Design a protein around this ligand. Sequence first.
Ligand code: ATP
Ligand code: ATP
Ligand code: 9V6
Ligand code: 9V6
Ligand code: K
Ligand code: K
Ligand code: K
Ligand code: K
Ligand code: MG
Ligand code: MG
Ligand code: MG
Ligand code: MG
Ligand code: MG
Ligand code: MG
Lengths: 264, 264
Amino acid sequence: PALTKSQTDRLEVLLNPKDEISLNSGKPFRELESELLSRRKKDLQQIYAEERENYLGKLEREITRFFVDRGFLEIKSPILIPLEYIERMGIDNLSKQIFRVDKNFCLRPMLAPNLANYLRKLDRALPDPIKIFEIGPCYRKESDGKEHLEEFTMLNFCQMGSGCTRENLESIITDFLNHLGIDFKIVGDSCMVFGDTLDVMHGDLELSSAVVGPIPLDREWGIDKPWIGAGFGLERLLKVKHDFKNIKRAARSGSYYNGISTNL
Amino acid sequence: PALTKSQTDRLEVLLNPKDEISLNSGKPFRELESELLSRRKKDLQQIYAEERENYLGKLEREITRFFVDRGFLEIKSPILIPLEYIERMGIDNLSKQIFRVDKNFCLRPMLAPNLANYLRKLDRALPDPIKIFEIGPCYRKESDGKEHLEEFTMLNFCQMGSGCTRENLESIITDFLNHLGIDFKIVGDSCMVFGDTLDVMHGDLELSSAVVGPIPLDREWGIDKPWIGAGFGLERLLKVKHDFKNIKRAARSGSYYNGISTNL
Ligand SMILES: Nc1ncnc2c1ncn2[C@@H]1O[C@H](COP(=O)(O)OP(=O)(O)OP(=O)(O)O)[C@@H](O)[C@H]1O
Ligand SMILES: Nc1ncnc2c1ncn2[C@@H]1O[C@H](COP(=O)(O)OP(=O)(O)OP(=O)(O)O)[C@@H](O)[C@H]1O
Ligand SMILES: N[C@@H](CCCCNC(=O)OCc1ccccc1Cl)C(=O)O
Ligand SMILES: N[C@@H](CCCCNC(=O)OCc1ccccc1Cl)C(=O)O
Ligand SMILES: [K+]
Ligand SMILES: [K+]
Ligand SMILES: [K+]
Ligand SMILES: [K+]
Ligand SMILES: [Mg+2]
Ligand SMILES: [Mg+2]
Ligand SMILES: [Mg+2]
Ligand SMILES: [Mg+2]
Ligand SMILES: [Mg+2]
Ligand SMILES: [Mg+2]
């Protein structure tokens, strides 16, 4: 009844959180693999027959509706951005985590720079307060492990003008995570782009970093009003919602569809 | 009444297709600029007050519903892909249009490789026929002009197994563009990745290239069944729908929101 590392890895790929199957049950590999293969095929067949929606896409749509309905403008900004945005976010040569493209471009590691540009520009046209959000891919070179991806999906919402207080920021975070049914706490932390943050924690998992401005970086971006904002990783939200052991189950991938192995 | 090139460019930025304003009317720049600025601020204020949805995001959601409701599985696959996928799509060192990332990766220039992988894998689990689609960013270095972007958004749908005929492919294209209200014709063309294509044309604008397999490239991807597929550019669909002069009005950008200049 002794399984090799390769056999255990194959079974872990096929195991899903809802299964009440122990790989250490004492059953031989052939029977555990056959059982899990049958369950996962059934799971994919049910998805194909009924809903057909991708978890990341569906969560993006649900989040989009939530923020649009609360008065935030939906932004879709470039993923491929000037490398100069990095230096100007105060990221001195995190900078090592940047995927570079050609000589003067990079894949955005966060949504903040593009959203700062939109806050500044929209403040010339829209009534106070300015409320915007974006959901989309971001990129960082990571270690990684069970909680970091190199290609992940960020939500960042922000507001500039009136109402940009710690209590309003916390209230939006609370309403949002209550909508998703996710328990959390808020702890204070610091990072080097923004200074002090409010970190939104689910256990020992960071779901979001949030900031109450103004901060001295604002001048580099032409921001000259109070502001609040928060960034959330969608794959981390999915990891919590579906109780995935590893965040890769939630990622853009050819190896899992809605957390189900595609190697069947 | 003579406007400089810089003045005309500024007015063209602020002009929208619905305006019945001629820059050559004889009015001075100051009055044309003031009028257009007021119209565009009004337009953005109305968007902010009412719908708040981004054109690219909203079109993606509408397309997603169309294909999900017709039995296609929604895919979200990596944007950052192995450079090896390029060579294996038969793209010999289009290859010059690839944005390279590090030494062994690139930004995907098309959705086909990831979708071929999903067709192959899903054929081991799902009943015939296999029907899938993806919408998302793709990247090519272009010239460019009024119809090409370096960062654009592709829809690619495909089917493998039964029903993979020219007539079914045309029927899906027809139902899809009828749903969007876009007139078109089909013309034969060729490309070097897929061979003969059916090009979906709106006037002299190519909306899609479509392929009826099998093709000899299939073996490199483990595809061994009949298949059909088509790829559409969402920004080109928006250019037609909103009568934009230049495709940049439709792109991910900090310079236009739903075709309205953000420089106000
Ligand atoms: N590599 C990554 N993979 C997946 N999600 C991420 C990654 N980096 C950040 N996120 C998500 O984006 C949110 C805001 O990003 P932020 O810039 O605060 O990241 P972070 O503080 O470096 O995260 P961590 O401390 O876990 O590395 C995070 O709270 C997390 O949900
Ligand atoms: N650079 C681009 N910018 C915007 N849309 C594009 C671009 N390249 C391709 N598309 C869209 O993707 C669809 C399928 O792409 P395909 O690989 O057939 O491109 P293509 O034939 O090179 O386009 P074109 O002939 O106009 O350069 C095209 O019909 C078009 O709608
Ligand atoms: N993941 C991010 C943390 C996200 C916190 C929210 N940030 C935001 O809403 O930015 C908009 C903004 C507005 C005004 C001035 C400047 C700026 Cl950036 C990080 O890397 O710390
Ligand atoms: N824009 C693209 C044209 C898109 C046409 C549709 N292609 C497709 O559905 O691929 C799936 C697929 C299935 C099976 C075997 C191989 C493959 Cl690729 C280009 O660059 O010509
Ligand atoms: K389990
Ligand atoms: K990924
Ligand atoms: K016009
Ligand atoms: K773009
Ligand atoms: Mg980090
Ligand atoms: Mg952190
Ligand atoms: Mg953080
Ligand atoms: Mg081309
Ligand atoms: Mg062409
Ligand atoms: Mg083509």
